[PDB]
Write a protein that binds this ligand. Structure first.
Ligand SMILES: CC1=C[C@@H](C)[C@]2(CO)CO[C@@H](c3ccc(O)cc3)[C@H]1[C@H]2C
Ligand SMILES: CC1=C[C@@H](C)[C@]2(CO)CO[C@H](c3ccc(O)cc3)[C@H]1[C@H]2C
Lengths: 245, 9, 239, 10
């Protein structure tokens, strides 16, 4: 796998180039918000981002080395975590607000327009505040997001019979290289060796909170689809059904 | 499955 | 100033090893077959009793009593199922295919099918134990990871209180790295392993969220009465 | 009067 022969610099460069674009919302700013219209705007946005995510994943070093089946499984597992971390990244320089789209910037109290949603906003906002506190760099952001893709579903690969954990060596090798890349990036920015392992753990513990938000967000979206608040795209329905609730 | 098709397309 | 922030790595490990809760037994009568209700009763009985030991372990985690009572409550309400689960996974390490809830209560994945929707949880736990085994997780590493979870899982949901916690979390990271250096790993392998261990916490969070929804599902189905303490730890996740 | 509350105090 050529992804294993990449230098740290080539890894960073490859991930930066694979970055999806920031999309716009169809929000008509002269129109009012309602629970249903807001959910419509957000799910619509998400669905369109999903298509760009799929093509981003294909550009993450080592992802295409995996079977179509493994790829599907990972993306099904990580999709919301990946949308959310990008959201939090986009919102870093908008304290107290979430930049869902350049033309769709919502504060906390606008979250209260959707029942159950402000709880999710509060978590996204606190995470955004942690990104600012740590002064997270873009290079680390793309490393974290690729780690989420390869890691989130890696321990849910079970054998058909016996259902025992399948050993995915290649996936772990890639993750290990992303670790090498993160450390390299920190050493180049002048962090001491001790600061490097401390900052590494801090960045990775962020993913625990991103998982949490993803699961709470998944339950919330699921709740809306079931109250028929908003119609979901087939892609979105399927991404949701890959999960249990 | 849509994801499946999007991935190979 | 403080207390935890002046601990050496050896002292951190020593402190954590000493705080460790005992391995409790189940009231399981091994002469009688399981029902859905008896299984649930056994498991929730056990968990209730572990909760009491956990709270007392948490007070023994360096830097945990420095926090306000309400921050202590918040961290435990958030991490409790994650803490029980990593505990379970750690105990089951040397038992492939099995979950050692207690020494006298070692269950196979097929026995997860006693309780509706429980086998899906069992599989995730079994998968995590298999992974601990693959890494040859060490006991010293385990105690570090569990303390990390306690201090990390709710720290964003809280700021000197939060900066203090992050200082303590950095000492635990130092301690983990110390153990790896002590084990003769190279610099590059230390960094790699650290990442590998901490990424496991993302899966443990996932299992906790899923187990929380299952436990809540089992509470509505009212198959077994849960203790007030268990009910309150659970209700802290609702809403 | 949360039980956890009491257990932590004592
Ligand atoms: C506290 C719990 C009780 C039982 C009902 C459940 C139901 O799936 C199974 O796993 C439980 C558990 C976890 C760790 C532990 O030390 C004891 C029980 C955990 C639950 C997810
Ligand atoms: C896709 C989502 C689904 C649920 C979790 C919510 C409502 O709570 C709907 O849309 C939000 C979202 C998040 C990130 C993103 O890139 C696009 C939309 C995000 C959540 C705000």
């Amino acid at each position: 796998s050529l992804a294993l022969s990449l230098t740290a610099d080539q890894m960073v460069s490859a991930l930066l180039d694979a970055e999806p674009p920031i999309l716009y919302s169809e929000y008509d700013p002269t129109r009012p918000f309602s629970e249903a219209s807001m959910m419509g705007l957000l799910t619509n946005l998400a669905d369109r981002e999903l298509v760009h995510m799929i093509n981003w994943a294909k550009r993450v070093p080592g992802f295409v080395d995996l079977t179509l089946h493994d790829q599907v499984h990972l993306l099904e597992c990580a999709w919301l975590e990946i949308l959310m971390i990008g959201l939090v990244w986009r919102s870093m320089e908008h304290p107290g607000k979430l930049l869902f789209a350049p033309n769709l910037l919502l504060d906390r109290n606008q979250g209260k327009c959707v029942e159950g949603m402000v709880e999710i906003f509060d978590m996204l906002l606190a995470t955004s505040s942690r990104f600012r506190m740590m002064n997270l760099q873009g290079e680390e952001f793309v490393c974290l997001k690729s780690i989420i893709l390869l890691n989130s579903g890696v321990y849910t690969f079970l054998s058909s019979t016996l259902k025992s954990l399948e050993e995915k060596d290649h996936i772990h090798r890639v993750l290990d290289k992303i670790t090498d890349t993160l450390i390299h990036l920190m050493a180049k920015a002048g962090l001491t060796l001790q600061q490097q392992h401390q900052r590494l753990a801090q960045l990775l513990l962020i993913l625990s909170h991103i998982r949490h938000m993803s699961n709470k967000g998944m339950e919330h979206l699921y709740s809306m689809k079931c109250k028929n608040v908003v119609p979901l795209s087939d892609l979105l329905l399927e991404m949701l059904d890959a999960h249990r609730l | 499955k849509i994801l499946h098709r999007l991935l190979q397309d």
